[PDB]
Design a protein around this nucleic acid. Sequence first.
RNA 1: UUACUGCACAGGUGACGA
DNA 2: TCGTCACCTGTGCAGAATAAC
Length: 758
Amino acid sequence: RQLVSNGFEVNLPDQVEVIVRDLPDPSKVKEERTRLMGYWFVHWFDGKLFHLRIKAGGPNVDGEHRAIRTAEHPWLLRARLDDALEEALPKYAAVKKRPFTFLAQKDELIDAAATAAGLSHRLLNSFKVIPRFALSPKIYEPVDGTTRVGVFVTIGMRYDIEASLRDLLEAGIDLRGMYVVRRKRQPGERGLLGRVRAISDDMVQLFEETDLASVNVNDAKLEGSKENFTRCLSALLGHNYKKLLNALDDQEAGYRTGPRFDDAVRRMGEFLAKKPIRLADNINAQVGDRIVFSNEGQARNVRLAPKVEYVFDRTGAKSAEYAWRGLSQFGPFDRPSFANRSPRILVVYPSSTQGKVENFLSAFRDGMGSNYSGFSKGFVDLMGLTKVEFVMCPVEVSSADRNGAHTKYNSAIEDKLAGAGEVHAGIVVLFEDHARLPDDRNPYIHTKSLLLTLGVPTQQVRMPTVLLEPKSLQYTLQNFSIATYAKLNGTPWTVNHDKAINDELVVGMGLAELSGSRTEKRQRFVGITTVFAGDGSYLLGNVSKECEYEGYSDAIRESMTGILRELKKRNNWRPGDTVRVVFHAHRPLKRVDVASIVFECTREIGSDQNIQMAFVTVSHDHPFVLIDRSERGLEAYKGSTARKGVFAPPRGAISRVGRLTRLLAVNSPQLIKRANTPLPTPLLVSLHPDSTFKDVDYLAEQALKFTSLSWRSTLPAATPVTIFYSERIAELLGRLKSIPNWSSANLNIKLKWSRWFL
RNA sequence: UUACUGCACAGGUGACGA
DNA sequence: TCGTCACCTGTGCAGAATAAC
Ligand SMILES: [Mg+2]
């Protein structure tokens, strides 16, 4: 019935007396906050400076003496609450402001976990994992039209390596190549320094340096990355350190699992409620009841969308609630019409892996048999094909080759394809040592580039994957198979939809930011994905091939007007039919581009039809989480009383935060991985205020459905494919643009229907 | 680069205003 | 060209046999 938040009501005064000055130049703000510090809280907003006296005593300030009512303009006290919260907890130092973020004072989980696993070492004490809390004052709407201010509590972990580098070398750890950051960060300065090349002195030489190429061991520390944690801890504890890691894992679950997260939030609120918070020398705020999402009173703030249906035919008849159960039963959605029932697949691999590749190939095509029910039938039978012909392309290359692997792959491919006929896809096997080389010598991107130029999509695979034990291999081959079929132009499945309106187009934009290393400046690229309403089905449209970030707003416009025009011809809209267009991205569009897009789409479809348009952003990293106390979770393992997903809301729960925003739960207990998996964070779905379509509950459920549309895997994706696919297109095309002999000519010819980006 | 999930660190960035 | 609110993207590691069943 009810969903509990991680936030607390804040009781504020109805009203606060203020002094206002017009200050059209906001540069002035800096100095004025200083001149009046301590006596005045100061705030700029729409051309005016607002002054809230906090302590008696000059300096005095001029301006109009206006009252500000909290119900009408809650931004004022919300901002003041950022500062007030810090001052209410003066024993807890801010490591970050707005939101106020601070460290637990006693608990330190590496010590705790070493003790708990029975481990010790003289440098452990310099490895620290400390709980970090943030208190975020946010405006929300308990019912439509009335605003309130809540305080939302979030929990993470500071990882830090405070050990001096002299010790870590002397203890047996190769520092070479690790990233190094400033111990003491310079006022609004960069922290990262570079990577350690060597040490011959108290100063260390750097490569991939951000500043000067030298700094003192006492100005520098390792960054608190996991990489540096495991590299350092394996080379001081191993191979026993895995016992530490899971011990550490056990400790953090003590702050992040549902019940334990709910408890820490409760205790934070009890602490914050003990006194009143001092907004000013005689005005008080009071932290109150835990905020809830419910349908009690006049509130209609929680709902549960129905389960998504994976659908495998166009009459609606062949549906399932899980993609893979649906695929095995029915075979793929487009099986009746699928054109090429005998595909020829190039398989490019190091000659010395031959036997391993043949067994992976045999399992993929013909299956693993009934002892491995995850992948019994194999690709040909799973997808309803006649057969699959493999064209073997061994490459005489060794994992130690670091400079010429790519040219050897590309020469082998070229010489093999010149005799042979047409191949319809390829499989490229990569050595793990080659997978992450720089792109100028990386065989993943060069073989991808060569084969895409020729109109051949590829499914690549790293040797550690080819060698997976059978219990995992079966799942690997489910995803491998779904993406290969899609790259052969197949459609594995759709998700259900009942059209209220005569046509619905969703288009999404994604971003990728590319650089050779953490020093070089990242270059932005974009991708565009389209999805169409069908008869009971969401259908994946075509996909961008141009990827430059400069001008992306015009590219959104062209793809929409072009698709609308084509949809009108196909479907032959009647006078009075309603067309709906939805846009998806991880960031909001500018108002001016919304206006430009509405205008062009409105003109394109013309006056015979009604057009509805909605502009949506999907956020993952916000201060909101949802707790379902009625949820006991699931049994994790055999002989395991321990549970997973305890308090996790169900997949499809949609909570109202305000008029334009919903919280969307995607990871149910069924999908949560492990007993120690944190309480999941829901997606935040936000509607652009200039949208002409306003039903964000519907848009929240549409985004949910689009997570189930991913053909990269049998399991749902963490964001709708409108965005996800586009990010994958953007990164690929971005990388390919710099590869010699890359050409996009075939992306709209041979690859027009290929899901080559999966 | 089979993926899902999680976390960490780093870089910063976006939208709205005058 | 600043204030203010907000959180995005890249990378690397690991999974109480990781894989909705
Ligand atoms: Mg892929």
